[PDB]
Design a protein around this ligand. Structure first.
Ligand SMILES: *[C@@H]1O[C@H](CO)[C@@H](O)[C@H](O)[C@H]1NC(C)=O
Ligand SMILES: *[C@@H]1O[C@H](CO)[C@@H](O)[C@H](O)[C@H]1NC(C)=O
Ligand SMILES: *[C@@H]1O[C@H](CO)[C@@H](O)[C@H](O)[C@H]1NC(C)=O
Ligand SMILES: *[C@@H]1O[C@H](CO)[C@@H](O)[C@H](O)[C@H]1NC(C)=O
Ligand SMILES: *[C@@H]1O[C@H](CO)[C@@H](O)[C@H](O)[C@H]1NC(C)=O
Ligand SMILES: *[C@@H]1O[C@H](CO)[C@@H](O)[C@H](O)[C@H]1NC(C)=O
Ligand SMILES: *[C@@H]1O[C@H](CO)[C@@H](O)[C@H](O)[C@H]1NC(C)=O
Ligand SMILES: *[C@@H]1O[C@H](CO)[C@@H](O)[C@H](O)[C@H]1NC(C)=O
Ligand SMILES: *[C@@H]1O[C@H](CO)[C@@H](O)[C@H](O)[C@H]1NC(C)=O
Ligand SMILES: *[C@@H]1O[C@H](CO)[C@@H](O)[C@H](O)[C@H]1NC(C)=O
Lengths: 344, 228, 210
């Protein structure tokens, strides 16, 4: 017999002790080496309830990533709480590695294996593991990058779809590469490339899936209504540099319905900023100009963060806008099938 | 103790834009969404949108799209509301609100325990229009042995208010002056009535005195039985 | 899109009595009740259907039957009167005004109808006025009939405050038509139903004839 519980997890990784890359260094001291032969026990005739939106594993990972970023991506100047902090800010080696989260003695992680599991409610096919899969602590807004894919159908995730204040996570079943590049020889200017044939077909499937959740209403996408640049644009870190990419073209209603002309390569305008709003929760940070040469990162778009327009209208359509900003949601998108329980 | 304190009331014209502020205190400002709700008598409370201070993320009510803007200043813990292209329909008391449940890890937005004191905003034309005054005639035959009703219909004026007296205030008994109604035209209308002995209809003169200060209008109208 | 239908529009009650306010929803979920006193910000009374907010006495209770949520306020005090709203997410009901009523014997209204004045008819519009004078209780229904056809959307009503002396109410109803529409019909009737009347009473006039 067991029961739902919360405890202090430990992390595991395949970090290299010789590596100067920031995630490797952190993991060397914070984590233990992974298990060569992991043990998964499928629980027969067992039905468990889950809730990805109230999973405290997310809280611990959040603390870890903040700790990672604070101790590794130090600004030249930190503007926070009326004060000003000037530090050394050397260029770093930056590339997220997979981090496993595991339970100590007396505790075990339960894993939901239902292929269409939406994040909350009962799960029929449950297994028992010590550690989660390898999760890369990728910090981004609007688009979830380099994450896991849904096994079968596209899955809509929300604590409550009828509540316009709750975040919506669209979990894709097919990756769509995003190829972002800052060329060699304005040094702050950059761009991301996406195959519009692949993206629009996926986006069409997203609208159809959303139709199933909102009574066959017309599904419409719009740009963000407002907010800081970190959320009104696709914000992410590539090779230590903070990227801001305009996603207006990524959500083209014209291409997902008269559907002729947008069948090619989509190029999003990006800019590398040295003055940023920190996601860690404080204020503004200042960094050195970008490194020289070719700055490039090819990522998998594996998820989308959305917010739905509220209001006492009466139309037969729902409007969705690229969301994000709550980085805890990023971890929720990978930790959704896990929950900690205590043995007796 | 959680507090929300709002800026002062405003008078606006059609076409103007308005900006109001809501200063928060007593809690961690960036942990909870701030909402804007407006109240107008005779209408449903209307949610205009929420704003999350962390990144300034917003969600605007669909029927206000393109007209409204919500921002915040993190240092002063103040939320700001802007509404453009004002019309008469925007006349209301504007409130900022916050949910009852809010922690550093979780919140529920919609149980509004906390309200600002409200910011009244009136949107109206500078123009004024004096009332038309029509008699509400007694009746046909003088039914000696009963009481008769007569009055004045005070129609199509703007803005409020008009007042009505009878016989320069000498007649008060049985006088009823009704609260005005707002018509489809955007102009106001009301009636004032008085019940009098039917046997007095051929002896005593009945005059309603209509006053409308905004248009500098004072009208006297004698109400007498129709001759037929 | 959540449809909240609140009823009734107005409650006229005396201190010590009970107010019963209901809200019908098109969607289940957490429903809240708010109180707004005159010249004051709204106040959270009940949330999650039946949970009392802080400072709210147990005279306030929320209940639910099917899609119908009810706020019941027992032993009404002065501080209880005002307008009440139900709420689900961003949606609010139309509100229920609870106002103080002083009790007295039932009194049927005296009903008068006023044809348009010849002076107004020169302007192109026709206003027909029906007066309901000195009645109690406040609850009354007025219907307009033009050539025995029920009218909808072309009338406006107004009610006086309860009289300080005789504790009665009076009501004015105005039917507004174009001059062209007015001269199209003959019988202009206004029908009054009230507890003080054994049967609905109709006052009418025929156009043209005196
Ligand atoms: C149960 O889950 C495992 C692991 O995900 C999967 O391989 C297996 O097919 C599932 N079986 C059923 C009956 O769902
Ligand atoms: C997820 O499935 C549960 C169980 O059927 C259901 O209650 C909930 O509404 C679903 N959520 C979404 C977003 O589909
Ligand atoms: C992804 O899911 C959609 C339905 O949401 C389905 O039509 C499509 O075939 C799936 N693609 C896969 C499994 O590769
Ligand atoms: C990106 O997706 C491809 C196929 O979907 C996969 O082979 C690759 O490992 C992914 N990249 C990651 C997980 O970094
Ligand atoms: C990414 O884009 C750059 C420049 O557009 C190109 O040279 C490179 O080959 C691309 N990478 C991939 C994997 O397509
Ligand atoms: C986009 O992807 C499709 C396959 O999904 C491929 O056939 C096409 O050549 C790609 N477009 C470009 C411009 O590479
Ligand atoms: C994104 O680009 C479009 C180009 O049409 C522009 O209109 C929009 O303002 C841009 N958004 C931001 C946040 O800069
Ligand atoms: C959407 O696609 C159409 C046709 O390809 C194009 O004309 C339009 O500019 C696109 N919308 C954008 C780029 O926002
Ligand atoms: C995603 O993973 C690839 C290698 O698997 C890496 O080159 C890329 O920078 C990653 N993207 C982000 C945003 O970390
Ligand atoms: C959604 O909200 C309702 C109340 O608004 C609540 O009863 C329900 O449990 C919520 N659903 C989930 C999955 O949390």
């Amino acid at each position: 017999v067991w029961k739902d519980a919360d405890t202090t997890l430990f992390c595991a990784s395949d970090a290299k002790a010789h590596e100067t890359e920031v995630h490797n260094v952190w993991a060397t001291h914070a984590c233990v080496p992974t298990d060569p032969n992991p043990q998964e026990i499928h629980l027969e005739n067992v039905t468990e309830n889950f809730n990805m939106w109230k999973n405290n594993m997310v809280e611990q990972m959040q603390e870890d990533v903040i700790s990672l970023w604070d101790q590794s991506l130090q600004p030249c100047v930190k503007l926070t709480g009326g004060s000003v902090i000037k530090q050394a800010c050397p260029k770093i080696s930056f590339d997220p590695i997979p981090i496993h989260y595991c339970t100590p003695a007396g505790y075990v992680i339960l894993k939901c294996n239902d292929k269409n599991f939406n994040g909350t409610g009962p799960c029929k096919n449950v297994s028992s593991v010590q550690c989660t899969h390898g999760i890369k602590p990728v910090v981004s807004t609007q688009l979830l990058l380099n994450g896991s894919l849904a096994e079968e159908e596209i899955i809509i995730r929300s604590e409550n779809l009828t509540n316009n204040a709750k975040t919506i996570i669209v979990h894709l079943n097919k990756s769509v590469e995003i190829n972002c590049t800052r060329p060699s020889n304005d040094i702050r200017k950059a761009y991301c490339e996406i195959n519009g044939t692949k993206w629009n077909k996926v986006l069409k499937q997203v609208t159809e899936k959303l139709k199933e959740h909102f009574n066959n209403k017309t599904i419409i996408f719009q740009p963000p209504s407002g907010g800081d640049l970190e959320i009104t644009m696709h914000h992410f870190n590539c090779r230590g540099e903070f990227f801001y990419c305009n996603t207006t073209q990524l959500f083209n209603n014209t291409c997902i319905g008269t559907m002729k002309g947008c069948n090619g390569t989509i190029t999003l305008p990006c800019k590398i900023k040295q003055i940023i709003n920190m996601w860690q929760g404080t204020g503004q940070a200042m960094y050195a100009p970008p490194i020289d040469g070719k700055i490039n990162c090819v990522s998998n778009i594996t998820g989308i963060l959305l917010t739905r327009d509220g209001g006492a209208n009466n139309t037969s359509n729902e409007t969705f806008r690229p969301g994000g900003g709550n980085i805890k949601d990023n971890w929720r998108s990978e930790l959704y099938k896990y929950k900690v329980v205590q043995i007796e | 103790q959680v507090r929300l304190s709002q800026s002062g009331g405003q008078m606006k014209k059609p076409g103007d834009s308005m900006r109001i502020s809501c200063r928060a205190s007593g809690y961690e400002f960036q942990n909870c969404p701030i909402n804007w709700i407006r109240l107008a008598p005779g209408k449903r409370p209307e949610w205009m949108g929420w704003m999350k201070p962390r990144w300034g993320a917003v969600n605007y009510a669909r029927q206000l799209q393109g007209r409204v803007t919500m921002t915040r200043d993190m240092y002063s813990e103040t939320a700001f509301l802007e509404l453009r292209s004002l019309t008469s329909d925007d006349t209301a008391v504007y409130f900022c609100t916050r949910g009852k449940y809010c922690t550093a890890r979780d919140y529920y937005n919609w149980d509004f325990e906390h309200w600002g004191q409200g910011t009244p905003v009136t949107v109206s034309s500078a123009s004024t229009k004096g009332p038309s005054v029509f008699p509400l005639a007694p009746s046909s035959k003088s039914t000696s042995g009963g009481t008769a009703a007569l009055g004045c219909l005070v129609k199509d004026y703007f803005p409020e208010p008009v007042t009505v007296s009878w016989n320069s205030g000498a007649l008060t008994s049985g006088v009823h002056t009704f609260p005005a109604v707002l018509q489809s035209s955007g102009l106001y209308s009301l009636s004032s009535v008085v019940t009098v002995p039917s046997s007095s209809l051929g002896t005593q003169t009945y005059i309603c005195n209509v006053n409308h200060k905004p248009s500098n209008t004072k009208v006297d109208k004698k109400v007498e039985p129709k001759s037929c | 899109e959540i449809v909240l239908t609140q009823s009734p529009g107005t409650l006229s009650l005396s201190p010590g009595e009970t107010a019963i306010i209901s809200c019908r929803t098109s969607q289940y979920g957490s429903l809240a009740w708010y109180q707004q006193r005159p010249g004051q910000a709204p106040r959270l009374v009940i949330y999650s259907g039946s949970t009392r907010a802080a400072g709210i006495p147990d005279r306030f209770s929320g209940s639910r039957w099917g899609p119908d949520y009810n706020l019941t306020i027992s032993n009404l005090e002065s501080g209880d009167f005002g307008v009440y709203y139900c709420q689900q997410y961003e949606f609010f009901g139309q509100g229920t005004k609870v106002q103080v009523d002083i009790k007295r014997t039932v009194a049927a209204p005296s009903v008068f109808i006023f044809p348009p004045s010849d002076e107004q008819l020169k302007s192109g519009t026709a206003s027909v006025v029906c007066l309901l004078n000195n009645f109690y209780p406040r609850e009354a229904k007025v219907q307009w009939k033009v050539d025995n056809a029920l009218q909808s959307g072309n009338s406006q009503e107004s009610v006086t405050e309860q009289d300080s002396k005789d504790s009665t109410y009076s009501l004015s109803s105005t039917l507004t038509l174009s001059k062209a529409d007015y001269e199209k019909h003959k019988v202009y009737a206004c029908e009054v139903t009230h507890q003080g009347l054994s049967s609905p009473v109709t006052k009418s006039f025929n156009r043209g004839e005196c």
